[PDB]
Amino acid sequence: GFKQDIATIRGDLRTYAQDIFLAFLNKYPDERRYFKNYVGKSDQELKSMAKFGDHTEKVFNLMMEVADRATDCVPLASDANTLVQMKQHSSLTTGNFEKLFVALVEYMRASGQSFDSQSWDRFGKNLVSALSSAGMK
Binding site for ligand 5JC (CB under 6 A): 21, 55-56, 59, 100
The least distance separating ligand 5JC from the CB of residue 66, rounded to whole angstroms, comes to 13
Quick note: the x/- pattern for ligand HEM over 30-49, rule CB under 6 A, is: -x--xx--------------
118 labeled part of a ligand binding site: no
The answer to whether residue 58 forms part of the interface with ligand HEM (CB under 6 A) is yes
97-111 exposure pattern, b = at least 16 Cβ within 10 A, e = fewer:
bebbbbbbbbbbeee
Quick note: the x/- pattern for ligand HEM over 74-93, rule CB under 6 A, is: ---------x----xx--x-
Long-range contacts from 105-114, C-beta under 8 angstroms, 24+ separation: 106/23, 106/27, 107/19, 107/20, 107/23, 108/5, 113/8
The answer to whether residue 100 forms part of the interface with ligand HEM (CB under 6 A) is yes
DSSP secondary structure letters along 64-124:
HHHHHH-BTTB--HHHHHHHHH-GGGTT--HHHHHHHHHHHHHHHHHSSS---HHHHHHHH
Quick one: what does residue 92 bind among ligand 5JC, ligand HEM, none, with the CB cut-off 5 to 8 Å set by partner type? ligand HEM
Query: Interface residues with ligand HEM (CB under 6 A)?
Result: 31, 34-35, 51, 54-55, 58-59, 62-63, 83, 88-89, 92, 96-97, 100
